[PDB]
Design an enzyme around this catalytic site. Structure first.
Site, PDB file in Angstrom:
ATOM      1  N   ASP A  63       0.864  -1.165   0.000  1.00 34.86           N
ATOM      2  CA  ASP A  63       0.000   0.000   0.000  1.00 34.86           C
ATOM      3  C   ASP A  63       0.914   1.232   0.000  1.00 34.86           C
ATOM      4  O   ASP A  63       1.662   1.461   0.948  1.00 34.86           O
ATOM      5  CB  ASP A  63      -0.952  -0.047   1.192  1.00 34.86           C
ATOM      6  CG  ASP A  63      -1.856   1.167   1.365  1.00 34.86           C
ATOM      7  OD1 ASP A  63      -1.683   2.193   0.637  1.00 34.86           O
ATOM      8  OD2 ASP A  63      -2.770   1.065   2.171  1.00 34.86           O
ATOM      9  N   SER A 144      -1.934  11.700 -16.402  1.00 34.16           N
ATOM     10  CA  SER A 144      -3.245  11.655 -17.000  1.00 34.16           C
ATOM     11  C   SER A 144      -3.390  12.894 -17.889  1.00 34.16           C
ATOM     12  O   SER A 144      -2.760  13.932 -17.625  1.00 34.16           O
ATOM     13  CB  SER A 144      -4.338  11.656 -15.950  1.00 34.16           C
ATOM     14  OG  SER A 144      -5.631  11.727 -16.545  1.00 34.16           O
ATOM     15  N   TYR A 156      -8.848  14.354  -7.798  1.00 36.90           N
ATOM     16  CA  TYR A 156      -8.074  13.664  -8.805  1.00 36.90           C
ATOM     17  C   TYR A 156      -7.290  14.665  -9.666  1.00 36.90           C
ATOM     18  O   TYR A 156      -6.095  14.495  -9.876  1.00 36.90           O
ATOM     19  CB  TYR A 156      -8.971  12.810  -9.687  1.00 36.90           C
ATOM     20  CG  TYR A 156      -8.238  11.959 -10.706  1.00 36.90           C
ATOM     21  CD1 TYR A 156      -7.618  10.784 -10.330  1.00 36.90           C
ATOM     22  CD2 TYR A 156      -8.212  12.321 -12.048  1.00 36.90           C
ATOM     23  CE1 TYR A 156      -6.996   9.958 -11.245  1.00 36.90           C
ATOM     24  CE2 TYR A 156      -7.575  11.518 -12.979  1.00 36.90           C
ATOM     25  CZ  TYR A 156      -6.989  10.333 -12.581  1.00 36.90           C
ATOM     26  OH  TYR A 156      -6.396   9.513 -13.478  1.00 36.90           O
ATOM     27  N   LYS A 160      -3.113  14.931 -10.126  1.00 40.13           N
ATOM     28  CA  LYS A 160      -2.377  14.636 -11.350  1.00 40.13           C
ATOM     29  C   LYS A 160      -1.566  15.836 -11.828  1.00 40.13           C
ATOM     30  O   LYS A 160      -0.466  15.671 -12.383  1.00 40.13           O
ATOM     31  CB  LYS A 160      -3.343  14.071 -12.385  1.00 40.13           C
ATOM     32  CG  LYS A 160      -3.828  12.676 -11.997  1.00 40.13           C
ATOM     33  CD  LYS A 160      -2.730  11.607 -11.994  1.00 40.13           C
ATOM     34  CE  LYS A 160      -3.290  10.215 -11.858  1.00 40.13           C
ATOM     35  NZ  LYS A 160      -2.228   9.200 -11.830  1.00 40.13           N
TER      36      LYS A 160
HETATM   37  N1  LIG Z   1      -7.906   4.215 -16.868  1.00 41.78           N
HETATM   38  C1  LIG Z   1      -7.858   5.506 -17.215  1.00 41.78           C
HETATM   39  O1  LIG Z   1      -8.732   6.061 -17.897  1.00 41.78           O
HETATM   40  C2  LIG Z   1      -6.665   6.310 -16.810  1.00 41.78           C
HETATM   41  C3  LIG Z   1      -6.378   7.488 -17.496  1.00 41.78           C
HETATM   42  C4  LIG Z   1      -5.238   8.214 -17.156  1.00 41.78           C
HETATM   43  C5  LIG Z   1      -4.440   7.820 -16.116  1.00 41.78           C
HETATM   44  N2  LIG Z   1      -4.733   6.667 -15.419  1.00 41.78           N
HETATM   45  C6  LIG Z   1      -3.881   6.275 -14.301  1.00 41.78           C
HETATM   46  O2  LIG Z   1      -3.422   4.944 -14.507  1.00 41.78           O
HETATM   47  C7  LIG Z   1      -2.978   4.430 -13.218  1.00 41.78           C
HETATM   48  C8  LIG Z   1      -3.460   2.992 -13.055  1.00 41.78           C
HETATM   49  O3  LIG Z   1      -4.895   2.972 -12.917  1.00 41.78           O
HETATM   50  P1  LIG Z   1      -5.826   2.038 -13.849  1.00 41.78           P
HETATM   51  O4  LIG Z   1      -6.525   2.870 -14.841  1.00 41.78           O
HETATM   52  O5  LIG Z   1      -5.065   0.851 -14.319  1.00 41.78           O
HETATM   53  O6  LIG Z   1      -6.885   1.631 -12.742  1.00 41.78           O
HETATM   54  P2  LIG Z   1      -7.138   0.365 -11.783  1.00 41.78           P
HETATM   55  O7  LIG Z   1      -8.004   0.771 -10.643  1.00 41.78           O
HETATM   56  O8  LIG Z   1      -7.526  -0.775 -12.674  1.00 41.78           O
HETATM   57  O9  LIG Z   1      -5.668   0.119 -11.295  1.00 41.78           O
HETATM   58  C9  LIG Z   1      -5.180   0.850 -10.142  1.00 41.78           C
HETATM   59  C10 LIG Z   1      -4.168  -0.023  -9.460  1.00 41.78           C
HETATM   60  O10 LIG Z   1      -3.613   0.697  -8.328  1.00 41.78           O
HETATM   61  C11 LIG Z   1      -3.718  -0.128  -7.185  1.00 41.78           C
HETATM   62  N3  LIG Z   1      -3.806   0.707  -6.005  1.00 41.78           N
HETATM   63  C12 LIG Z   1      -4.854   1.518  -5.618  1.00 41.78           C
HETATM   64  N4  LIG Z   1      -4.653   2.102  -4.455  1.00 41.78           N
HETATM   65  C13 LIG Z   1      -3.372   1.696  -4.087  1.00 41.78           C
HETATM   66  C14 LIG Z   1      -2.595   1.930  -2.937  1.00 41.78           C
HETATM   67  N5  LIG Z   1      -2.960   2.703  -1.921  1.00 41.78           N
HETATM   68  N6  LIG Z   1      -1.411   1.299  -2.852  1.00 41.78           N
HETATM   69  C15 LIG Z   1      -1.035   0.499  -3.850  1.00 41.78           C
HETATM   70  N7  LIG Z   1      -1.678   0.172  -4.954  1.00 41.78           N
HETATM   71  C16 LIG Z   1      -2.861   0.805  -5.009  1.00 41.78           C
HETATM   72  C17 LIG Z   1      -4.929  -1.029  -7.426  1.00 41.78           C
HETATM   73  O11 LIG Z   1      -4.870  -2.217  -6.685  1.00 41.78           O
HETATM   74  C18 LIG Z   1      -4.745  -1.349  -8.909  1.00 41.78           C
HETATM   75  O12 LIG Z   1      -3.815  -2.418  -9.034  1.00 41.78           O
HETATM   76  C19 LIG Z   1      -3.450   5.442 -12.168  1.00 41.78           C
HETATM   77  O13 LIG Z   1      -2.409   6.345 -11.788  1.00 41.78           O
HETATM   78  C20 LIG Z   1      -4.538   6.222 -12.918  1.00 41.78           C
HETATM   79  O14 LIG Z   1      -4.713   7.505 -12.323  1.00 41.78           O
HETATM   80  C21 LIG Z   1      -5.831   5.912 -15.776  1.00 41.78           C
END
Ligand SMILES: NC(=O)c1ccc[n+]([C@@H]2O[C@H](COP(=O)([O-])OP(=O)(O)OC[C@H]3O[C@@H](n4cnc5c(N)ncnc54)[C@H](O)[C@@H]3O)[C@@H](O)[C@H]2O)c1
Ligand SMILES: NC(=O)c1ccc[n+]([C@@H]2O[C@H](COP(=O)([O-])OP(=O)(O)OC[C@H]3O[C@@H](n4cnc5c(N)ncnc54)[C@H](O)[C@@H]3O)[C@@H](O)[C@H]2O)c1
EC number: 1.1.1.209
Lengths: 299, 299
Positions: A63, A144, A156, A160
């Site tokens: 975490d 992002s 959020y 970012k």
């Molecule tokens: N999916 C989108 O549209 C999008 C767009 C731009 C940026 N992002 C970024 O991509 C990254 C990954 O997110 P995603 O889209 O794969 O979503 P997701 O929720 O599928 O993956 C998030 C991951 O982070 C982990 N996580 C959450 N809280 C945590 C903590 N306290 N400690 C450790 N791990 C933790 C979760 O277990 C999961 O494995 C993030 O930084 C998100 O902001 C996503």
């Protein structure tokens, strides 16, 4: 592509590998021949990833908001990688938090996304940085398009934005050590991050305790009509997560990694360009769909 | 300039009025005829400002990081301004925190600037926002060129980046209520914010407890040679604080306030333009002066 050599001798540490980009990254880099250290928030996420991957991959429970867990994990990596150091750090873990109009929120509602997405990213980076320096390696930060253009109320967006600024401070600090820092800015991708139903649930929780005047201004069923826009243009969410992992791959394996990667067709052709424009243009485009308030003069 | 009418009937709430921009703003708007509510961190700052101003100005003691003090202050404003609401909110309070190379810092070192500059700004805004809506008034956020281009390690950069993103979320949320939101981005100005001697003192405190390897890489007297650049180009710090207060004045009194104001000649002609450029150009310009490390291969 002059790529790096000796992929098989290089360790890559990835945060947030239970689902989404980080899960796909761990699986992809494992198959490519890197030694992956996949940090997972949950035991069941860890066990699933381990069952799908080779013996070269190790999982750890992390975490990123728990500084003791971060420090212990960094000590474990340090002993494991030894004098190779850590070739790659992918700061991927992140959460959406509550998304709602700014006037519905308290300051406490901003804390969670900032704690994971900014403070957790910083602490992981700082704890691993001696190892990356040792390898003359690569720090990859997942930002992002929402770190360049503000999409809506809540923590959020500021989280970012802050990651973009930290990224750049880190990059310039690390140039002297031959460490490269890359920032990845995805558009919208189908993961577990955002889910219209979960977003609506959080808004309903907030609505229950909102002041009478706010509820009069927005109007009953504002949230219902909100869900009917989230749905009414969810057809342009990317399904191909490998567009983002492909950026990570280049950042880790190119001899000339980029400082910024943009992922998603609309991201590169429209959103990031618009992020450079003044508010008068941005506001016109982004407000087009927003639900009319019932009684905006009820102030 | 079609300006607003009835300045004399409008309240303006300013955070951080002990010194710097906020002190000058309070004095300027008092003389202009606004009813100023000047929030001060210290009793002696409050007493000095009161002694210099008219009976139309009220001072209040506010630490923007104390949520109870914020809420109480907002209740006091609410009763005082009544059905006029609050025409202006100037979110000015801010601190630099520790500025040092990223690899010298812990995550705790980032918390203070973020708590004042971001969280304090958000909480003040959220507590005052019903009153600004009532007035169909103006929120003015003091950012920095450091919220658009990262100047160095530490929490100040991420804090200001985050304020830019919050600003924009707030602006688009508040359009429906006829509330205007302006972001002011100053270049460098002679205030109590930054003081090379105080910045050097914080670095020396950190140096005492840095790991041996960091100290070998940077080299003894890195900090001394650092102070000899902070000094060696301190000749382009603006002395005229009224350039920033003039922006605040327009944001408060114009019928067409801007979404962004840039203050400082170098800010508008060079820094904000460069903030749009990719890292390859920025890094070349900003690294020009940086002190060479003694032993960068000691990793
Ligand atoms: N999916 C989108 O549209 C999008 C767009 C731009 C940026 N992002 C970024 O991509 C990254 C990954 O997110 P995603 O889209 O794969 O979503 P997701 O929720 O599928 O993956 C998030 C991951 O982070 C982990 N996580 C959450 N809280 C945590 C903590 N306290 N400690 C450790 N791990 C933790 C979760 O277990 C999961 O494995 C993030 O930084 C998100 O902001 C996503
Ligand atoms: N001076 C510059 O070069 C410069 C450049 C760009 C932006 N800014 C911004 O201008 C704003 C004002 O700073 P300044 O340059 O006048 O510096 P300053 O230190 O002279 O003024 C800061 C003010 O904020 C107050 N303050 C500090 N901590 C506070 C807290 N917890 N609660 C309430 N008040 C608090 C201080 O008492 C003081 O009145 C800040 O947001 C700063 O980041 C300054």
């Amino acid at each position: 592509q002059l790529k790096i050599a000796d992929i098989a001798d290089k360790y890559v540490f990835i945060t947030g590998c239970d689902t989404g980009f980080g899960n796909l990254a761990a699986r992809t880099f494992d198959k490519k021949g890197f030694r992956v250290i996949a940090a997972c928030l949950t035991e069941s996420g860890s066990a699933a990833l381990k069952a799908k991957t080779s013996e070269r991959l190790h999982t750890v429970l992390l975490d990123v908001t728990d500084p003791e867990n971060v420090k212990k994990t960094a000590q474990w990596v340090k002993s494991h990688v030894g004098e190779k150091g850590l070739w790659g750090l992918i700061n991927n873990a992140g959460v959406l938090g509550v998304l709602a109009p700014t006037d519905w929120l308290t300051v406490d509602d901003y804390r969670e996304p900032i704690e994971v997405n900014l403070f957790g990213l910083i602490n992981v980076t700082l704890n691993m940085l001696p190892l990356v320096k040792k390898a003359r390696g690569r720090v990859i930060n997942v930002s992002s398009i929402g770190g360049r253009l503000a999409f809506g109320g809540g923590g959020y967006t500021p989280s970012k934005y802050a990651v973009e600024g930290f990224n750049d401070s880190l990059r310039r600090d690390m140039k002297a050590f031959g460490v490269h820092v890359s920032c990845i800015e995805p558009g919208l991708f189908k993961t577990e991050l955002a889910d219209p139903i979960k977003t609506t649930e959080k808004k309903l929780a907030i609505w229950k305790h909102l002041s009478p005047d706010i509820k009069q201004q927005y109007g009953e069923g504002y949230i219902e009509k909100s869900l009917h826009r989230l749905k009414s243009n969810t057809s342009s969410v990317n399904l191909d997560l490998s567009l983002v992992v492909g950026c990570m791959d280049h950042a880790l394996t190119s001899l000339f990694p980029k400082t910024r990667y943009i992922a998603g067709k609309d991201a590169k052709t429209f959103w990031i360009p618009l992020s450079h424009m003044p508010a008068v243009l941005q506001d016109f485009l982004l407000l087009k769909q927003k639900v009319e308030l019932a009684n905006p003069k009820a102030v």
